[PDB]
């Protein structure tokens, strides 16, 4: 019935918010739609897999908040396997390699690839993390799809094909669906292209021992009965002195403030009294989440390692169901598995098939890519289509179509009376990730501690001590990388020499 | 409690649907979220204006369904004033003209303008009304914004800006926000460029005496207590034998079938059990409505008519709050008024101002465009900002961003078990309009009649005889208009 703060949503962001508010001495309630906590994280446990992350999974250096929270809850990380060679599969052939980026040999193509990555990071520096709409050319770039930007930037089909896969794989959406400004922002607020695509020294370095669902579960364990499962919030009323929050099972909750810790667009499921302001009213109809199926195929052994393949595959091609894989063998070396993502329009297309038809298509793909018949001998298959989740909307996160971030962006985390906004979408560092869920959750919580006069204004946004378990190597460039010309730059050098 | 069919939404679409079902002998309830019916139509009455449509208002030839329904409810139309000259205001000067399309004098610009309009209708001829995702070039056109298309097509800044205005005005969104495929479909399913922009012999030819809101009020009058106001639906359950529909005020309604007659995205305000199929679950997050403020300034007299202006203004440029006006004077010659739309980003921007501040800006603009100090002396002002409506989400209608129509368009009017889908968005002729809303409510109702055994499959989609009161004249083109080259075509001859 009565408390200080009601948190709507029991994902990482909600549970991080509640935990901070509870640790500070307030009475909180977490209202959670599903029969479980975790949200876009979910750890399945059976005898065939022991445990497996069907949602959010990877962490890495610079993600210091999620690592501190996980460690405070008694969790440990382990390194994803990147000992052996990565594979770049393009035009029906596999090309093994080492280091984060697939190499390229053709000099024209080398210049175009170098310039693509460099330009992403170049445009990124123009874009404030905390206010993307303030970039000097915010409008010009927001009025563009990533597709249009790649049509202008990539002078080779090789670079354009790889850039297309990068977008799809990073934001589970087509290049023609997303704003260039938004995408550039998203990449920059993760710390740049190298940080986001890397396993070693980047976003995919590590997983938690026993799965990421433990984060939410263990916070629930601290909060006891304060967490209420199967409580979909339908109604928020701010007309009176106390905020009244109504659930679908006809319960009433009464509070001083509310944290909305749900994907922006899932805000549409709540009826508001009084109505939301114009700008938030339209914003939450303009921000969908991407489309992805996560698939894990299990095998007797990690046979690929024996061929000096770490199990990372970067798979270009329309025929290919999966575009990216990682090794998902346990750190012990057992329950050998390949993890892969089916992305964007391929999630739409291939969801029409049965579980068994998807397994077959993956095994056949893996067989060709790894040059192994063993890939046709799976011992188990687990999967989750995030597109069919009423209380997620999709995965990994919310993307912004063209025109939306400059017009509506500033209201994402603008409080509405005594409603405050968390969720990873509201973060300024690794928004989209579990890291961003923790940042947004703790920031939202502290916004309320300020409103209550319990902390000063400068303690709302709090920096995070670098992890001592997972320290960050800095991102370096070479002289050549920095100064080699673009393709158009070389053409200008050719027109000038011959004059 | 118990009935044959629950309709969610008491806009024109819901009401048209409920009326049809009720007339055929079924017990229908209409659940409406607001304290009124009409939805994106709303007629305000006061002594100062008498009545004024603050939402959907205009009807015209080929919109035979809204005309027939309205005629049956005892409503009549009158012609929007277009006797005198239109005005195109470009680079701070007023150019009077007659006929639907503002003229062009420079030969190059001329070729370019001619090519733009012709090209929208050519592209449209390859888009099926009932299935735009089947256009031969569906994917290629769906993956561009209308900004990209206009950048390719328009060789002059003049044509690019008039085409940008055209997009902004028709679908209340920016060229860069919308799929080219969707926009081309939209125009095509209204009968082409000429039909959609024309007052005489087009979509803006007529209004309803007493206001459009009478359509819904009078259907509510016919259904009596069967319409439940302030009943926002929150929960639809199809697990059991009958469908259970729950409202925010806690009431339980039980039925054999449901019609959802709300804008697709407002589907998100409903919790479903079992959950929605994947494709609809994502669709309803990907389909916003435009942004618009409708503004009506009242004057002592229709003074513009003294200067041989009809009150139609087409106003180029960023600085103008309003890009388009019509005469909103009553047919009797009184309650003189000018109606203007503040579109898209200008709606987001100018909404921060006060009502008085908007009125001042509009009056100063009209003074300049009409070239008259009489515009500075308004006697009254009414406006509505549809962006702020929880239960509309905007106006006029839902637009499709790049990528969505081809990927999710199929799911729009596909039944989900015992839920059938109406609303103007699901129509195939004048979707987006009150005509659309009628077509879709009556279709959705007739789908339920078929599921129930009462009518054959071939009677779900019913043609409509032409209104005798509002006949359509044919759309024609000249020989020059059809065969004059584009700018690039003139250059491939040189
Ligand atoms: C789904 C997913 C997946 C599948 C995956 C992933 C993910 C996801 N992610 C994301 C995460 O998970 C997120 O972020 C989080 O979790 C979020 O959180 P929050 O914020 O908390 O939210 P949520 O969870 O959702 O929660 C919510 C809640 O609430 C509720 N509700 C609703 N409604 C309602 C409610 N309640 C009450 N009432 C109402 N009404 C619900 O239920 C819930 O509970 C992630 N993240 C991280 O961190 N990690 C990971 O891993 C993840 N994942 C992902 C991945 C990604 N990626 C990255 C990138 C990569 C790629 C790279 C590359 C590129 C390129 C290249 C070239 C070739 C060179 C390479 C590489 C991939 C991966
Ligand atoms: C808003 C608006 C405005 C402002 C305006 C307009 C409009 C609108 N429109 C549209 C209409 O209105 C529509 O379509 C209709 O109405 C719709 O219907 P429906 O479908 O039925 O829907 P609604 O109404 O929305 O309803 C729904 C209902 O539901 C409810 N709910 C929700 N949720 C819920 C519920 N319930 C229960 N539960 C739940 N959950 C609600 O409440 C409601 O009630 C229109 N239309 C027509 O027809 N007309 C008109 O007028 C209109 N308007 C408009 C405008 C138009 N435009 C056209 C075009 C023009 C332009 C021309 C031109 C262009 C260019 C040129 C150059 C320069 C050359 C020229 C010219 C403008 C105008
Ligand atoms: C003749 C030039 C070929 C176009 C090459 N692409 C990369 C397609 C476009 C360059 C765009 S931009 O010119 O740099 O704006
Ligand atoms: C010159 N513009 C109009 C910029 C493009 C010409 C169109 S085209 O793409 O070159 O056919």
What CATH number is associated with residue A33? 3.50.50.60
Q: Which of B203, B201, B249 is nearest to B229 (CA)?
A: B249
Ranges of beta strands (E only) in A344-448 are 380-385, 419-421
Mutate to test the interface with A, among B150, B245, B268 (most CBs of A within 10 A): B268
Nearest CA to ligand 1 atom 53: A56
- A403 chain-B contacts, CB cut-off 8 A: 173-174, 176-177
* Structure token pair of residue A266: 């899932």
Q: Are residues A276 and A345 in the same domain?
A: no
Whose atoms come closest to the Cα of B422: which ligand? 2
Under an 8 A CB cutoff, do B345 and A407 touch? Answer: yes
Residue B314: which CATH number?
Answer: 3.90.660.10
A248 neighbors A259 (Cβ within 8 angstroms): no
**A257 Cα: distance to centroid of ligand 2 (angstroms):** 36
Under an 8 A CB cutoff, do A143 and B174 touch? Answer: yes
Interface A-B: count of C-beta contacts within 8 A: 123
Angstrom distance (rounded) from CA B231 to CA B32: 5
* Structure token pair of residue B310: 């009809």
Last residue of a domain, one of A171, A197, A223: A197
Q: Is the CB of A166 under 6 A from ligand 1?
A: yes
Last residue of a domain, one of A197, A223, A246: A197
**B394 Cα: distance to centroid of ligand 2 (angstroms):** 9
Helix, strand or coil, per DSSP, at residue B379: coil
Q: Are residues A324 and A202 in the same domain?
A: yes
**Model resolution, angstroms:** 2.3
Identify the burial level of B35 via C-beta atoms within 10 angstroms of its C-beta, where 0-12 means exposed, 13-18 middle and 19 or more buried: exposed
Q: Which of B65, B39, B7, B174 is nearest to B431 (CA)?
A: B65
Q: Which residue bears the tokens 């000067």?
A: B93
Under an 8 A CB cutoff, do B235 and A235 touch? Answer: no
Q: Are residues A111 and A231 in the same domain?
A: no
State the nearest Cα–Cα gap between A153 and chain B, in angstroms.
16
**Residue B479, in any domain of the structure:** no
Total domains in chain A come to 3
Query: How many CB atoms neighbour CB B312 within 10 A?
Result: 22
* Structure token pair of residue B322: 């309003």
State the nearest Cα–Cα gap between A484 and chain B, in angstroms.
31
Q: Which domain holds residue B187?
A: 106-197
What is the largest distance, in Å, between two alpha-carbon atoms of chain B? 75
**Residue A118, in any domain of the structure:** yes
Q: Are residues A279 and A237 in the same domain?
A: yes
Angstrom distance (rounded) from CA A284 to CA A400: 11
Whose atoms come closest to the Cα of B156: which ligand? 4
HSE, CB side, 13 Å, CA atoms: give it for residue A472: 21
Q: Are residues B219 and B361 in the same domain?
A: no
B153, B379, B448 from B69: Cα distances, Å = 41, 35, 20
Q: Which of A11, A258, A272, A426 to mutate to test the pocket of ligand 1 (most atoms within 8 A of CB)?
A: A11
Q: Are residues B414 and B356 in the same domain?
A: no
**A433 Cα: distance to centroid of ligand 1 (angstroms):** 6
Q: Is the CB of A427 under 6 A from ligand 1?
A: no
**What's the DSSP call for residue A248?**
T
Angstrom distance (rounded) from CA A136 to CA A127: 8
**Residue A126, in any domain of the structure:** yes
Strands B309-315 and B85-90: parallel
- B145 chain-A contacts, CB cut-off 8 A: 145, 402
Q: Which residue bears the tokens 């999630």?
A: A347
**B176 Cα: distance to centroid of ligand 2 (angstroms):** 22
State the nearest Cα–Cα gap between A270 and chain B, in angstroms.
6
Whose atoms come closest to the Cα of B151: which ligand? 4
Query: How many CB atoms neighbour CB B407 within 10 A?
Result: 23
Q: Are residues B221 and B178 in the same domain?
A: no
CA closest to A235 among chain B residues: B248
What is the largest distance, in Å, between two alpha-carbon atoms of chain A? 82
Beta-bridge partners for B43? B53
**Residue A67, in any domain of the structure:** yes
**What's the DSSP call for residue B412?**
T
Q: Which residue bears the tokens 């009025």?
A: A143
Last residue of a domain, one of A364, A383, A400: A400
- Residues B456-480, buried b or exposed e (16+ Cβ, 10 A)? eeeebeeebeebeebebeeeeeeee
Sign for the CA dihedral angle at A152, A154, A157, A161 comes to negative
**Residue B6, in any domain of the structure:** yes
Angstrom distance (rounded) from CA B448 to CA B460: 9
**Residue A495, in any domain of the structure:** no
Angstrom distance (rounded) from CA B307 to CA B248: 55
**Residue A489, in any domain of the structure:** no
Mutate to test the interface with B, among A146, A402, A416 (most CBs of B within 10 A): A402
Ranges of beta strands (E only) in A32-160 are 43-44, 52-53, 77-79, 85-90, 93-97
**B39 Cα: distance to centroid of ligand 2 (angstroms):** 8
Q: Are residues B259 and B405 in the same domain?
A: yes
Angstrom distance (rounded) from CA B200 to CA B211: 19
* Structure token pair of residue A264: 């922006």
Q: Which of B433, B438, B483 is nearest to B464 (CA)?
A: B438
Helix, strand or coil, per DSSP, at residue B293: strand
Ranges of beta strands (E only) in A289-336 are 292-298, 309-315, 324-327
Angstrom distance (rounded) from CA A137 to CA A159: 24
Q: What contacts A429, CB < 8 A, 6 or more positions away? A: A62, A129, A189, A190, A435, A436, A439
Q: Are residues B379 and B266 in the same domain?
A: no
Q: Is the CB of B155 under 6 A from ligand 4?
A: yes
Alpha-carbon torsion angle B150, B153, B156, B161, nearest 10: -20
Q: Are residues B379 and B394 in the same domain?
A: yes
Under an 8 A CB cutoff, do B390 and A291 touch? Answer: no
CA closest to B404 among chain A residues: A177
Residue A149: which CATH number?
Answer: 1.10.405.10
Q: Which residue bears the tokens 């819901």?
A: B14
A110, A123, A148, A155, A159 from A488: Cα distances, Å = 13, 17, 17, 8, 14
CA closest to B246 among chain A residues: A248
Q: Are residues A421 and A431 in the same domain?
A: yes
**Residue A468, in any domain of the structure:** no
Q: Are residues A117 and A193 in the same domain?
A: yes
* Structure token pair of residue B116: 């733009």
B309-312: list long-range contacts, CB under 8 Å, 24+ apart: B309/B84, B309/B85, B309/B86, B309/B87, B309/B96, B309/B370, B310/B81, B310/B82, B310/B83, B310/B84, B310/B85, B310/B86, B311/B81, B311/B338, B312/B82, B312/B86, B312/B87, B312/B199
């Amino acid at each position: 019935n009565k408390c200080d703060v009601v948190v709507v949503g029991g994902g990482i962001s909600g549970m991080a918010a509640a935990k901070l508010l509870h640790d500070s001495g307030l009475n909180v309630v977490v209202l959670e739609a599903r029969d479980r906590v975790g949200g876009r994280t979910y750890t399945l446990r059976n005898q065939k897999v022991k445990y497996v992350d069907l949602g959010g999974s990877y962490v890495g250096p610079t993600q210091n908040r999620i690592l501190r929270l996980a460690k405070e809850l008694g969790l440990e990380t382990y390194k994803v396997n990147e000992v052996e060679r990565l594979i770049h599969h393009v035009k029906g052939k596999s090309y093994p390699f080492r280091g984060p980026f697939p190499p390229v040999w053709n000099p024209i193509t080398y210049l175009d690839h170098n310039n693509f990555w460099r330009t992403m990071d170049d445009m990124g520096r123009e874009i404030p993390s905390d206010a993307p709409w303030k970039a000097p050319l915010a409008e010009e770039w927001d009025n563009m799809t990533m597709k249009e930007l790649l049509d202008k930037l990539c002078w080779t089909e090789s670079a354009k094909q790889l850039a297309t896969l990068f977008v799809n794989l990073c934001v589970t959406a087509e290049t023609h669906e997303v704003s260039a400004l938004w995408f550039l922002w998203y990449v920059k607020q993760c710390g740049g292209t190298t940080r986001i695509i890397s396993t070693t020294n980047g976003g995919q370095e590590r997983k938690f021992v026993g799965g990421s669902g433990q984060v939410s579960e263990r916070i629930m364990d601290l909060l006891g009965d304060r967490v209420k499962l199967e409580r979909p919030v339908i109604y928020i009323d701010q007309t009176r002195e106390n905020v009244l929050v109504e659930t679908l099972n006809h319960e009433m909750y009464e509070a001083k403030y509310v944290i909305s810790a749900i994907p922006p667009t899932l805000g549409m499921k709540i009826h508001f009294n009084p109505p939301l302001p114009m700008m938030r009213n339209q914003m939450i109809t303009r921000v969908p989440l991407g489309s992805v199926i996560k698939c894990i195929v299990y095998y007797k052994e990690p046979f690929w390692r024996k061929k000096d393949y770490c199990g990372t595959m970067i798979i270009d091609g329309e025929e290919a169901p999966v575009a990216y894989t990682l090794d998902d063998t346990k750190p012990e070396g057992n329950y050998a598995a390949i993890m892969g993502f089916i992305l964007a329009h391929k999630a739409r297309k291939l969801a029409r098939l049965t579980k068994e038809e998807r397994l077959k298509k993956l095994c056949e793909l893996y067989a060709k890519v790894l040059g192994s018949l063993e890939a046709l001998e799976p011992v188990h298959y687990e999967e989750k289509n995030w597109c069919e989740e009423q209380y997620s909307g999709g995965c990994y996160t919310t993307y912004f179509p063209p025109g939306i971030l400059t017009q509506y962006g500033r209201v994402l985390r603008q409080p509405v009376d005594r409603i405050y906004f968390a969720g990873t979408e509201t973060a300024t560092h690794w928004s989209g990730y579990m890291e961003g869920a923790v940042e947004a959750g703790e920031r939202a919580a502290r916004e309320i501690l300020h409103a209550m006069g319990k902390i000063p204004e400068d303690e709302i946004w709090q920096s995070e001590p670098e992890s001592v378990d997972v320290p960050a190597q800095p991102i370096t460039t070479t002289f050549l990388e920095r100064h080699l010309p673009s393709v158009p730059g070389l053409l200008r050098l050719i027109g000038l020499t011959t004059i």
